[PDB]
Design a protein around this ligand. Structure first.
Ligand SMILES: CCCC(=O)Nc1cc(NS(=O)(=O)c2cccs2)cc(-c2csc(=O)[nH]2)c1
Length: 124
């Protein structure tokens, strides 16, 4: 019931490093990672472990911060916007799979606010 986790490397896809991407790893991701509500989002959802047998029946573009971290470490992204889209997909997936007011959704909401605070201004 678990598909393979999202790719963190792809030899068909060009790599890049930018000041913004470096910041996304060093500052944004590594700070969000330490937040008290980061733990549900540090790895791909394991539907067997977590007893969420419909997770991947609902969520067709899964994403998590562990994957994002590995992508940043591997220079998988072309630019910061591509990485930002992955965070936004992670947050949106949470709102889609769950319901307003759920504890997991309150966690995602808090992390998304902090994320927006940190990406409001990126290095030039
Ligand atoms: C494997 C590390 C622990 C973990 O991630 N647990 C967990 C439990 C659960 N189920 S739970 O009832 O224990 C829970 C409720 C509030 C935070 S976790 C869900 C998720 C989840 C991540 S994204 C998403 O939509 N859900 C994650």
């Amino acid at each position: 019931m678990n598909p393979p986790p999202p790719e963190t490397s792809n030899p068909n896809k060009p790599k890049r490093q930018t000041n913004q991407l470096q910041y996304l790893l060093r500052v944004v991701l590594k700070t969000l990672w330490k937040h008290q509500f980061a733990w549900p989002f540090q790895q791909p959802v394991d539907a067997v472990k977590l007893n969420l047998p419909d997770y991947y029946k609902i969520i067709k573009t899964p994403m998590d911060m562990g994957t994002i971290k590995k992508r940043l470490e591997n220079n998988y992204y072309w630019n910061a916007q591509e990485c930002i889209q992955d965070f936004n997909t992670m947050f949106t997936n949470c709102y889609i799979y769950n319901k307003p007011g759920d504890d997991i959704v309150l966690m995602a909401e808090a992390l998304e606010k902090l994320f927006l605070q940190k990406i409001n201004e990126l290095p030039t």
